[PDB]
Amino acid sequence: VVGGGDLGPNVLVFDPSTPDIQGKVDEVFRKQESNQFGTDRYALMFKPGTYNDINAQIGFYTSIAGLGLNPDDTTFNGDVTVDAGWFDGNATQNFWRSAENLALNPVNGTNRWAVSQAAPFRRMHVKGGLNLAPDGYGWASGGYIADSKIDGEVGPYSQQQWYTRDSSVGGWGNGVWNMTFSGVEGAPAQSFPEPPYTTLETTPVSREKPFLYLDGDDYKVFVPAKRTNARGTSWGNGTPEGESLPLDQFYVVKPGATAETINAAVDQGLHLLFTPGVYHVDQPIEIDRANTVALGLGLATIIPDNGVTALKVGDVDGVKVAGLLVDAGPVNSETLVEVGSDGASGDHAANPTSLQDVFVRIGGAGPGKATTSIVVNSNDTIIDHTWVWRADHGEGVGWETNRADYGVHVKGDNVLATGLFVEHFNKYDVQWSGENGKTIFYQNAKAYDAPDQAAIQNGDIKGYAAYKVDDSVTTHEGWGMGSYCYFNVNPDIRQQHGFQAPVKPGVKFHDLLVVSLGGKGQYEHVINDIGDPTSGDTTIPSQVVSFP
């Protein structure tokens, strides 16, 4: 396999002299604006410099990024904008897009990023305020900010929940159900339940997402070193720690590539750069070399055929998977992503493997099925922003038609999840069977389409927890976690709890909530048999500050 080469027709590379930048970005936006389940994919990459008179409106399956070592190397006097015009001010389907490694000087002092899930905002410098809500305070369900500096105020307004880590903000305007912060300079003080702020002084460990940049006229991928007890940006003090990898040390994957060729690339020592596109594979992509980077551009998507697993990472240190959508095929896959092998007991503490901006979809763009979407066997793994989503709308949706029993199953020890979004599974959305796990920010919604109580009976429990810790576990900690229901097929259903866990002094939760949307079903409790049921049709959360 030959490394390096051209990035393909779906990576649009701009510099300040490029003619009609605005028209070009507008053309992509008109194509992608309401293209929720289409198969086009775009990455908009900007060379270092200053860009004037630009409002880069970002639609579905569009990633926009600067190519400097530092965000302030690529500055827009202008905006990188997500709004909800196509959906009449409702921002709850603004998925699958991204912005990173840019400085913004927004036209009216405020940049609007009105997104919901799988819309990461990383390594950004906003010289002004950041508005997270659609124009009109419509519904919105984000969101994820990391390694960013916002000079002014962040305004969530109608956003339901949000996670921010290892950043700096000039202000924070409000909370709704669950705003969580770890390592954020300027974060509001811990105050849950009112306002619902969950605030941690540092992030236990984090490692910023690799990204493409230009060193002179050479393309390279920067690979940040991990930080322990992280706080504030990784780049504020100029010189960031990490390794730079030449693009010729990457297999540049373009659609047409087979899993055989991709796997041969890794075997031969090359990293992986998935250009924007959709990759249908008939055997798993196997990453069994330590320190391999597998970086997607433009919401690059992998679809496994034949019921195979899409991506398997071996029991090795340092693998960095980033920026990939895994879309289930119609033939049921036993697993979609596996990190490490069943029973693996080696540690990876100095140099862990990470999944970042890894999104999973089951159904929605046609029937799709998978039993367990992500299994995490390797100890010390970091899951830093994932959305694992069984579809509730689109093509191929049905209690049986896109059945997906389990979202994420964590079996490894010392696994950390930061920004964990998992929704709509027929059984447990998240199970945690490994020791000393930690989750900072959880967002769940329970399956809308359970047909009746008997269909979700779980032994002597009504329904399956959104987040279950196995009874054998002795240490676990979670912060800022919410489960919502909207049993619209059968609103007489009861869900016993959002959370289930053994009662042990080492198993601790902070700032839990469950919520029924419009009285469509109700929760009996928050965790186990503890916490008030939801009641009424007024969408008021039931909360638990500390457990046990």
Q: What is the dihedral of CA 477, 356, 497, 506, to 10 degrees?
A: -10
Using CA atoms, how far apart are residues 341 and 379, in angstroms rounded to an integer?
11
Instruction: Report the candidate in 447, 441, 514 with the shortest Cα–Cα distance to residue 483.
Output: 514
Q: Where are the beta strands (DSSP E) in 42-194?
A: 42-46, 49-57, 62-66, 74-81, 97-100, 103-104, 110-112, 121-122, 125-126, 129-131, 144-146, 149-155, 161-172, 178-185
Q: Which of 238, 242, 290, 297 is nearest to 266 (CA)?
A: 290
How far, CA to CA in Å, does 192 sit from each of 91, 195, 439, 513?
Answer: 25, 6, 17, 10
Q: Are 480 and 198 in contact (CB under 8 A)?
A: yes
Instruction: Provide the token pair at 388.
Output: 């694992």
Taking a C-beta distance cutoff of 8 angstroms, is the pair 333, 308 a contact? yes
Structural biology method used: X-ray
Tokens read off for 518: 């419009």
The single-letter DSSP state of residue 190 is: P
Resolution, expressed in angstroms to one decimal: 1.8
Q: What is the DSSP string of 335-371?
A: EEEEES-TT------SS--EEEEEEEEESBBS---EE
* Residue labelled with tokens 């405020």: 110
What is the dihedral angle through the alpha carbons of 84, 85, 89, 92, rounded to the nearest 10 degrees?
Answer: -30
Exposed / middle / buried, residue 2 (Cβ in 10 Å: 0-12, 13-18, 19+): exposed
CA distance 24 to 267: 39
> Under DSSP, is residue 204 helix (H, G, I), strand (E, B) or coil?
strand
CA distance 535 to 484: 13
Within 10 angstroms of residue 89's Cβ, the number of other Cβ atoms is: 18
